[PDB]
């Protein structure tokens, strides 16, 4: 139980460790607590990450919706929860993703990747700003 910072809860099993790398969260001097494969009332098993005196970038919260849709982000101040929400999915994601179209110009050239995001049913679709192709976020997140 931290005093001030962030608690990312309801992370799906085997995802917790990824977020640590991808967001370089452990590259800090700030105290960190992590629980992997924790028992969950609503999930059975879950991962959990606590970071003191630290808050996510909008960059980091935007990406979080893809990685872990059902995850909750808690902002704590003075030993108390102050902000609690499911991370809001954006419509553009820059830099982190790689177009799975191998003949996309985005592979050879000094530009940041960029995708337009939408759809429900099952997977969510990412449309490359460059080649205009659209893919399931399953195929894309298998970078």
């Amino acid at each position: 139980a931290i005093k001030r910072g962030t608690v990312i809860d309801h992370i799906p099993a085997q995802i917790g460790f990824k977020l640590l790398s991808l967001f370089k969260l452990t590259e800090t001097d700030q105290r960190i607590t992590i629980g992997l494969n924790l028992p969950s009332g609503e999930m059975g098993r879950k991962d959990l990450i606590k970071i003191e005196n630290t808050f996510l970038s909008e960059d980091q919260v935007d990406q979080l919706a893809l990685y872990a849709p059902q995850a909750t982000v808690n902002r704590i101040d003075n030993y108390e929860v102050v902000g609690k929400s499911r991370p809001s999915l954006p419509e553009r994601i820059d830099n982190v993703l790689v177009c799975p179209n191998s003949n996309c110009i985005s592979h050879a050239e000094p530009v940041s990747s960029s995708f337009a995001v939408r759809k429900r049913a099952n997977d969510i679709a990412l449309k490359c700003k460059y080649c205009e192709k659209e893919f399931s976020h399953n195929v894309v997140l298998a970078n």
Binding site: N101, N103, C104, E109, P110, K129, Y130, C131, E132
Partner: protein
């Protein structure tokens, strides 16, 4: 200013019905009475990173008919990108300090879009980017259809051949779907089918389309029969069984066609259209090519002139 002044022309997806009608109206007028000095004092880059006959030559001729000058290259092998390792980005960054507009064709999808990020106030015209988009082809196609059919709505359109890699039919299907009551017939091998993203767009607008395994199934029904070439230079090796034209149109297959039906093809053709088709009244792929001049003149005039009166 006209709606297309100083605009990049990358993808049909960014153009409205009105935008397309404007180019078509402007093309009609320029064909009727030429404006040989309309683009005087303009210098335009023609940068082709892959092969072209029709697109580059009609573009450059169109520039000259309007009085502009042309610089560029038809091969990248002697640019600094070809010999000194220069990026496309830097290439666009310097050329855009020289010219008033850039026409570009490139083997990678997205190259034209990327170019707009480095060309500042200089308009980019996509002459083709990989198997993605071919907007100026669609402009001439629409013009030709308009010419021969008197309309762009309520048509029966068959597209045949390599629909997967045909940037021509990606752009053309999108354009025709901005009009009302068109019906589409897709005749393609499975491995080279029309991509799902095009189909989904048709579904969202409530446009009828169906799949057919032969031309004869629809011959009596079609106003436009749009043939394509297998894009061998884009096939994955796993798709090499499709290199040969699966559907071959011959003069004899036209016996039950509508009288007004026209056979289109963005060209070049390999074997998908037999030479005995050329003399029939349905062949119109060369007149179609011919129309590249008026559509490309129109596009150039609209992008580089605030407004014109004609």
């Amino acid at each position: 200013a006209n709606p297309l002044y100083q605009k990049h022309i990358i993808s049909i997806n960014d153009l409205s019905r009105d935008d397309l009608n404007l180019v078509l109206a402007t093309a009609a007028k320029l064909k009727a009475n030429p404006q040989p000095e309309l683009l005087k004092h303009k210098v335009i880059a023609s940068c082709f990173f892959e092969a072209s006959t029709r697109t580059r030559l009609s573009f450059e001729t169109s520039m000259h008919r309007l009085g502009a000058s042309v610089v560029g290259f038809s091969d990248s092998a002697n640019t600094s990108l070809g010999k000194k390792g220069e990026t496309l980005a830097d290439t666009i960054s310097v050329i855009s300090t020289y010219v008033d507009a850039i026409v570009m064709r490139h083997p990678q999808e997205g190259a034209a879009r990327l170019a707009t990020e480095f060309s500042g106030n200089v308009p980019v015209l996509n002459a083709g980017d990989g198997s993605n988009q071919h907007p100026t082809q669609t402009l001439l196609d629409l013009f030709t259809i308009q010419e021969t059919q008197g309309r762009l709505d309520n048509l029966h359109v068959a597209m045949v051949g390599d629909l997967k890699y045909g940037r021509t039919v990606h752009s053309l299907t999108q354009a025709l779907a901005k009009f009302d009551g068109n019906r589409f017939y897709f005749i393609a091998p499975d491995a080279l089918a029309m991509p799902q993203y095009i189909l989904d767009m048709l579904d969202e607008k409530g446009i009828a389309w169906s799949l057919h395994s032969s031309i004869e199934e629809v011959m009596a029904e079609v106003d436009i029969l749009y043939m394509t070439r297998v894009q061998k230079e884009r096939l994955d090796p796993s798709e090499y069984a499709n290199v040969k034209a699966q559907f071959v149109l011959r003069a004899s297959d036209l016996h039950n066609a509508k009288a007004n039906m026209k056979v289109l093809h963005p060209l070049p053709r390999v074997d998908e259209i037999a030479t005995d088709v050329d003399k029939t009244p349905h062949a119109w792929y060369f007149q179609q090519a011919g129309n590249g001049i008026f559509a490309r003149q129109a596009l150039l005039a609209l992008v580089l002139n605030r407004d014109l009166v004609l």
